[PDB]
Design a protein around this ligand. Structure first.
Ligand SMILES: Nc1ncnc2c1ncn2[C@@H]1O[C@H](COP(=O)(O)OP(=O)(O)O)[C@@H](O)[C@H]1O
Ligand SMILES: Nc1ncnc2c1ncn2[C@@H]1O[C@H](COP(=O)(O)OP(=O)(O)O)[C@@H](O)[C@H]1O
Ligand SMILES: Nc1ncnc2c1ncn2[C@@H]1O[C@H](COP(=O)(O)OP(=O)(O)O)[C@@H](O)[C@H]1O
Ligand SMILES: Nc1ncnc2c1ncn2[C@@H]1O[C@H](COP(=O)(O)OP(=O)(O)O)[C@@H](O)[C@H]1O
Ligand SMILES: [Mg+2]
Ligand SMILES: [Mg+2]
Ligand SMILES: [Mg+2]
Ligand SMILES: [Mg+2]
Lengths: 731, 371, 375, 371
């Protein structure tokens, strides 16, 4: 039995998560209690599950717990893999690690000088597998593959907010520059550093988990030529939250830019825009926390104006962006009085609307009319209909979401104008700065869309892991059928397919008597007993459950329908496109289909386009882990760390690896280590044939190992069992 | 843990936790099933509805009664009713709290056994118990001695009790109850051309009954004032706006409790069964039963019934005996309140039939526990 | 998945056909359901007049061609001409092959079973549609109204019909179809214009009387008072300039014509007026739901597009119903496309994509399949 | 004196003297009124027409029925029908002979009161009486014990009787009758394009119904042979000489009596109301009621209905019960016949509300005389 008296195990804790314990006896089969030795003393006994006979996780030998890849461990379970990263981060202060293809990075909240030119010059020209794990190792892998294969590459950075995704992308970008010298005629690195403060101001918001989080997929292309020398860059944007512009969750707030405007309303230039307060403005008052503790949004507005000035966008255009943003909030204050026969109206000289019409340079009478009524065209005649108060707020808020998304894209076009070059690229490396899985005790449309986006990236990752293993098996002349493929497309098809979760939400969005409760009733009728994946709480009819890769997630049905709406009447676009202001004609420079899609259908469009962009490039992968929530240097918390490992999905790739053949060793390394076990009569004139013969005597079952042309593959725990036999022979 | 308490009422279920002053859930024990054709292609649809969500769809639904004559007629409907109470109404796991249920005297042994079986087989209750409605409404009345007349929707019953001990040979169950008064009310409204035929229309006649009807202190006098003065008439507004005039029938429908001949029964009136069940008791204790006639159940909610029942018991009993008829205001929930009190007492854990007792001894353990 | 083999949706109107794709807000094609045929000889051999003309190209040749009507009283009279109307819609108007997209069609309640079967047969055998469906106009105009409960009064060119609905369920005994419709109002209008010597006899002249009807006529709020002001004030005579150039006066007829809907005795019918049929069909429903039908009287179809009709209907129903019921009439603009819009909504639902009679299902089950699919 | 007897039929009146083997007068209870004007000077028309002289003027007159749902709707038209029977048909003064009239069970008190009032205050009758249709058709059948189902044009009632005594708790009234079958027949003929809309056309559909329709023994079997073999198709010449073809509708129409859901009723079928009426009777008499199911009234004159009824009751009753149905050859003339039997009975001469008796107790003398 591997349950001996020197073999430590792992016992759960509601605090330390996992405590190591040492066996005081050799466990015998059918024993119902096991005697253990904790770090606090031999004061513990262990009752074995009397229904399944389950024993605690065995600890790995001391010769295996010191490595830079989790794949080097024999036993592959949460206690062992959490501990391996923990000791590295605490004792050796190691931030990087490998999980097969994946690089992992634990944020040390402490200036590390492993980014000096002297480390860059030591790693340069050498093999990434001979070097220690580092951003430079995956960056120089991608550079080498781009030059050798003549094919574009992409590094996918993901994790929680504050985890180092931005920070790791800057180090990767610095390396891409230094590996080809410099671009002093373009200064792409300075322009990228000037873009990020203005991009996060318009694209990030405050959340209950973090004072600042990104709400979209940021994608930067780094271009190179035939000399593979960096010549320029481009900024791409995807999966942007639309609901945020209008709706705020409790203890959260809108995009930081909106409050930068609000805090700066004291200055004479912003005073002309007649900006008031965040409690008066609707798209901002809802959250209950307009200001962030320890942060001054007026100092951030000074920084973003300097960053715009470094990018070279005119101060006249900056003030134009501010004037538009002041306008869309005055528009949010336009409230409609209810009328008879499903109608509404606006008060005479309504002050938010008179200010809006003056700021946007449009006629009040036309703006008032196209909101008190709506147009309906036919093949014979045009007609005008009354519009309900609820239809008018939905149209106003869909219009506000649309015109902000156009303004965002306008700003991103100027960022591209600064980053691009007249010199054509021969090749390019992408960096994707996307997020991890999202879960809470109550989940909304936003969390659903975030998890749907993670499932697609996970499918690509799952396929790649299989593809590379299959290529390694074929190279070692080992049957592919011996590895199993674990994917997640059923969870994807459940959401986007016909009559799936998303298509029933679009159907309930178009139906005139559809409701959040009627959608929930449709989901219970269509997927409850037709998909074991789908689940439903018994003591409620307001929520539904979906199996996602990381864990199952429960979503509250209420709000989904309202948030999916994005329809806006084209006459309301026309009266703003005819603005006397110079910017609005350039914001709305086919539209008839686009102005009728739902948010969910726009999100699906965006995600599939990003998925095919990442499918064209050769992919690489890195995970960012935040070790605590107190922002303390080198402070590790097991509760936060195991949650991060789950969000990053790495506990499932470690499991796929363990279910297959994780540990693997060349016949010569195997011989060098276990020659002690071999007798003079056992050793042959060939070490390969020696190792094949003695391994079949040491381990009688033939499914425990796999013989290659150059290396032996092993199941989980089998190398630890050999090390146990090696130790038991010595003593 | 806090035990759950529920009255299995034949037309109205009450439910809550032990210690609650009043039942936190109350609804009609009605399943409603569609009777029309869905012509809206691609809409949200349900199979059958329960209580208030059946009553809001009357007409389009035809209505059912899982209990009749105080006994269960369909266990598949009762399973849905119980599911509703636990997860959809009280939102509580039945595996967490014990379940006290109720029943009328002279209820079949098979009805109690199958009710016991379902609680442990499908709802997986840790422990349960079935209590006679009478003893519970006497606990709510707060005396150790007294005869209860409990009259519900589907059954009416007399139970004399002394020093906490019932007299099982003296009890008298009667099938005349509030449903038969509703069925008679349709016939006597049809005499003025106000006919009704659907179960959805029967619910409107039932409202009319509960709103307008009352017991006469002297029928012959009330018939004479209805014929001569005619001032007893009331107009009622039906759901489509039309008014109907209801008078004379306002005292004739409940008078059936004292005169069962109206509906062709050979059975004696409610006062005569209270008198006869006291006469079955020992002569030394009758005086204490006459001093403690407890009214109970929703059919005892007729204006004037306590004064009549008195004139009627005083006419049968000796003139030396002090006839007293007590009627607890909240008669509709007297049984539930008594269950909520009983389930709270530290001296009730022995009565809880545990799952382990059911699994070992079989469903007939419920009878051994009770007797 | 912006591309869906987007279904085609069409209302087979007895005097006016509408068609388009699902998801179009309005019918992109609309024309008179008229086949015109020449009644004169060719003055030359190179004349070569088309054997038949359809819709607008028949209307531009009035008096030279005789106009027919492939539909009468809501039912098809000539299937060869309905094949010609359908062919026109597919390639000579929408410019689309019927083998690509499924087709939704429509009909009035109490339509004969053979009319539905032969319509389904021609679509699968002549046009070779992959899948098709046939929908009652009342549920479609209720989708366009946007409520799960109400009574619709649909009044077209060739048929009128009442249908009460609640919780998405209908009452098959309470429905009431009436043959009085916009064509009979046009025929009566010719008779009452003939009182001023304005005689009309051709179907080409009927079309001018039909324009006059749609342009000048209105429903009165009190007929006896409107007769008194017509006789005394005499300020109701509107001289309609005929297309040719004949200024012809129209006065009392501007209300006597549409009043036939409330007074069918003008045209010798024993049948009740439109308000009486809406009241009786509510009074056949169960007593609880009547209050919800009174709150939701939906007007639909082109014959309801008369000035004053909703206010008269509100008074006429209020005079019949109990005074405690709040009588509400629902009569928005453009009610002539309500049925089509409802078809375009239905064909766009994901839950409707399993309710398509397929070409294989027809080939296996035979023409009776359309009845199994409905009931 | 020789007493007069008349059945107030909702679509067909029968009349004659007590002692007549059959009603010497019979005609449709229809008043027809012109819906057109006068095309010539002179040629004076009647303001209203009665029975056969209305039927000969169809399309020129609109037909009205003074009785609906078994109750009178217009008393001025009932006074017109009554005048016709006395002088314009029987040629006899109502002042010379007493009059027996007939009504259904569960008929409004006001209908009976106004009927007796008009006969004394206008026809000045010396004495009169009003008798339930069921007891009369049971006297005609010839059994002191038997449940009689009288299905006419506007009413259908299952009335059980034993040793003469009726059971008012088990009687059952049903509004489904021969008129609703005629209205349904118009709908199912409209499915083949044979539409009908006037009351004059409804009379042709009614002839078609009475001539060609029949009750299926097993609906599914007759539906399968109608679909596969189609031999049930038959022709019919309309007045104008046009032939129409009717098949399947011939059994679908009268099947509504066993399946009232065709016309949207929640109500049970005629066999279920017969069974439920026996199940409400005392257990000792059920065997005698099963042995004596009497068919009565003109809607029972459909072929196959007695064989279907026997099968349907045999499927509901215990297999030991001898289900014996009796369908008197003249089910149509059975109420009138029993009325003339009770008219020639010399003992009944004590049960006649006299003219003086009427004056004594206003219009409710008939109520006391009956009950
Ligand atoms: N490798 C690192 N060394 C030191 N500090 C780091 C490192 N990675 C991240 N940080 C810290 O994390 C914060 C920035 O992380 P960032 O990548 O901007 O987070 P996110 O992109 O998740 O919002 C700063 O406090 C920074 O000092
Ligand atoms: N105020 C009232 N007047 C008359 N009858 C009433 C009144 N309130 C309730 N009822 C009748 O009492 C019965 C319901 O009372 P309840 O004790 O809850 O019966 P159960 O428990 O058997 O369902 C019904 O028959 C109802 O019509
Ligand atoms: N504005 C109007 N005023 C009066 N009658 C109208 C008006 N518009 C259309 N009609 C009449 O209504 C009928 C058109 O109704 P429609 O719904 O198009 O019928 P269908 O679909 O059966 O062809 C025609 O008789 C037409 O003359
Ligand atoms: N032979 C028959 N077959 C079918 N229906 C018939 C037949 N004879 C009469 N009826 C129908 O039965 C009804 C006549 O029943 P009857 O007893 O005369 O009623 P009432 O006395 O109320 O007028 C009418 O609806 C008539 O059409
Ligand atoms: Mg940040
Ligand atoms: Mg009770
Ligand atoms: Mg139409
Ligand atoms: Mg009869």
């Amino acid at each position: 039995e591997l349950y001996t008296k020197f073999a430590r195990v792992w016992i759960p804790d509601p605090e330390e998560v996992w405590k190591s314990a040492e066996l005081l006896k050799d466990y015998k089969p059918g024993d119902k209690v096991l005697l253990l030795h904790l770090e606090e003393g031999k004061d513990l006994e262990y009752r074995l599950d009397p229904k399944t006979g389950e024993l605690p996780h065995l600890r790995n030998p001391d010769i295996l717990v010191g490595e830079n890849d989790l794949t080097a461990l024999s036993y592959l379970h949460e206690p062992a893999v959490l501990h391996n990263l923990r000791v590295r981060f605490i004792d050796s202060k190691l931030i990087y690690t490998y999980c097969g293809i994946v690089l992992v990075a634990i944020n040390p909240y402490e200036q590390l000088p492993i980014y000096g030119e002297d480390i860059i010059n030591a790693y340069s020209g050498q093999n990434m597998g001979d070097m220690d794990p580092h951003i430079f190792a995956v960056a120089e892998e991608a550079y080498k593959q781009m030059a050798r294969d003549e094919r574009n590459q992409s590094i996918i950075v993901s994790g929680e907010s504050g985890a180092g995704k931005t920070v790791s992308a800057k180090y990767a970008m610095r390396y891409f520059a230094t590996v080809s010298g410099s671009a002093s005629e373009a200064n792409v690195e300075e322009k990228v550093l000037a873009s990020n403060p203005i991009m996060e101001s318009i694209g990030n918001a405050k959340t209950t988990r973090n004072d600042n989080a990104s709400r979209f997929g940021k994608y930067i292309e780094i271009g190179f030529d035939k000399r593979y020398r960096i010549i320029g860059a481009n900024m791409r944007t995807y999966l942007l939250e639309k609901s945020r512009v209008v709706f705020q969750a409790e203890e959260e707030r809108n995009y930081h830019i909106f409050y930068q405007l609000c805090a700066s309303a004291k200055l004479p230039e912003f005073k002309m825009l007649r900006l008031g307060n965040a409690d008066s403005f609707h798209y901002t008052k809802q959250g209950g926390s307009p200001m962030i503790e320890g942060v001054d949004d007026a100092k951030e507005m000074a920084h973003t104006r300097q960053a715009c000035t470094l990018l070279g966008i005119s101060e006249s255009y900056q003030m134009g962006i501010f004037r538009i943003l002041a306008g869309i909030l005055h528009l949010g204050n336009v409230g409609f009085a209810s009328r008879d026969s499903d109608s509404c109206t606006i008060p005479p000289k309504h002050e938010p609307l008179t200010i809006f019409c003056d700021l946007m340079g449009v006629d009040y009478e036309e703006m008032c009319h196209w909101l008190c009524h709506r147009k309906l065209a036919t093949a014979t005649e045009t007609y005008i209909k009354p519009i309900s108060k609820l239809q008018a707020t939905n149209a106003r808020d869909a219009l506000a979401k649309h015109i902000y998304a156009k303004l965002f894209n306008w700003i991103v076009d100027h960022v591209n104008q600064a980053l691009h070059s007249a010199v054509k690229q021969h090749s390019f490396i992408g960096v994707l700065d996307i997020y991890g899985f999202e879960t809470f005790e109550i989940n909304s449309f936003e969390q659903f869309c975030i998890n749907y986006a993670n499932e697609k990236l996970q499918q690509q990752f799952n396929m790649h892991v299989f593809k590379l293993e299959q290529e390694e098996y074929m190279k070692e002349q080992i049957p592919w059928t011996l590895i199993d493929f674990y994917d997640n497309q059923p969870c994807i098809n459940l959401i986007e397919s016909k009559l799936g979760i998303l298509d029933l939400l679009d159907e309930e969005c178009k139906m005139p008597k559809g409701t959040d409760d009627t959608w929930a009733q449709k989901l219970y009728n269509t997927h409850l007993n037709k998909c074991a994946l789908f689940e439903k709480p018994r003591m409620s009819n307001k929520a539904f459950i979906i199996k996602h890769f990381a864990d199952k997630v429960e979503y509250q049905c209420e709000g989904f329908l309202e948030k999916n709406k994005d329809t806006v009447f084209e006459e309301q676009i026309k009266v703003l496109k005819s603005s006397k202001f110079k910017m609005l004609p350039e914001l709305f420079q086919q539209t008839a289909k686009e102005h009728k899609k739902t948010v969910g259908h726009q999100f699906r469009n965006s995600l599939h386009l990003l998925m095919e962009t990442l499918n064209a490039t050769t992919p690489h992968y890195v995970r960012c882990i935040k070790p605590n929530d107190f922002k303390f240097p080198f402070t590790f918390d097991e509760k936060r760390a195991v949650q991060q490992l789950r969000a990053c999905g790495v506990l499932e790739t470690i499991r796929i690896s363990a279910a297959g053949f994780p540990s693997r060793w060349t016949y010569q390394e195997f011989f060098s280590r276990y020659r002690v076990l071999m007798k003079q009569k056992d050793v042959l004139g060939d070490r390969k044939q020696t190792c094949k013969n003695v391994l079949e005597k040491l381990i009688l079952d033939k499914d425990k190992y796999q013989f290659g042309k150059t290396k032996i593959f092993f199941r989980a725990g089998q190398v630890a069992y050999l090390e146990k036999l090696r130790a038991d022979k010595l003593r | 843990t806090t035990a759950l308490v529920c009255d299995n009422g034949s037309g109205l279920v009450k439910a809550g936790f032990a210690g609650d002053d009043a039942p936190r859930a109350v609804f009609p024990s009605i399943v409603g099933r569609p009777r029309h054709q869905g012509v809206m292609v691609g809409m949200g649809q349900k199979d059958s509805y329960v209580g208030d969500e059946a009553q809001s769809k009357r007409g389009i639904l035809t209505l059912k009664y899982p209990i009749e004559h105080g006994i269960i007629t369909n266990w598949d409907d009762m399973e849905k009713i119980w599911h509703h109470t636990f997860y959809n109404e009280l939102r509580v796991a039945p595996e967490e709290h014990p379940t006290l249920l109720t029943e009328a005297p002279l209820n079949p042994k098979a009805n109690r056994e199958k009710m016991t079986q379902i609680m442990f087989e499908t709802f997986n209750v840790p422990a349960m118990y079935v209590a006679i409605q009478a003893v519970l409404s006497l606990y709510a009345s707060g005396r150790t001695t007294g005869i209860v007349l409990d009259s519900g929707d589907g059954v009416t019953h007399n139970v004399p009790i002394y020093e906490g001990y019932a007299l099982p040979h003296a009890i008298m169950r009667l099938d005349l109850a509030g449903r038969d008064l509703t069925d008679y009310l349709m016939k006597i409204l049809t005499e003025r051309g106000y006919s009704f035929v659907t179960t959805a229309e029967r619910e409107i006649v039932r409202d009319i009954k509960e709103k307008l009807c009352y017991v006469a202190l002297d029928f012959e006098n009330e018939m004479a004032t209805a014929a001569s003065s005619s001032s007893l008439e009331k107009s009622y507004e039906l759901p489509d706006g039309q008014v109907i005039t209801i008078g004379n029938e306002r005292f004739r429908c409940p008078e059936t409790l004292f005169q069962p001949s109206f509906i062709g029964m050979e059975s004696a009136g409610i006062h005569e069964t209270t008198y006869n069940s006291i006469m079955k008791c020992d002569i030394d204790i009758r005086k204490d039963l006459y001093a403690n006639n407890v009214m109970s159940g929703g059919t005892t909610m007729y204006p004037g019934i306590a004064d009549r029942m008195q004139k009627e018991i005083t006419a049968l009993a000796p003139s030396t005996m002090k006839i007293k008829i007590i009627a607890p205001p909240e008669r509709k929930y007297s049984v539930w309140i008594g269950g909520s009190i009983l389930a709270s007492l530290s001296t009730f854990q022995q009565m809880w039939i545990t799952k382990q007792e059911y699994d070992e001894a079989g469903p007939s353990i419920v009878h051994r526990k009770c007797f």
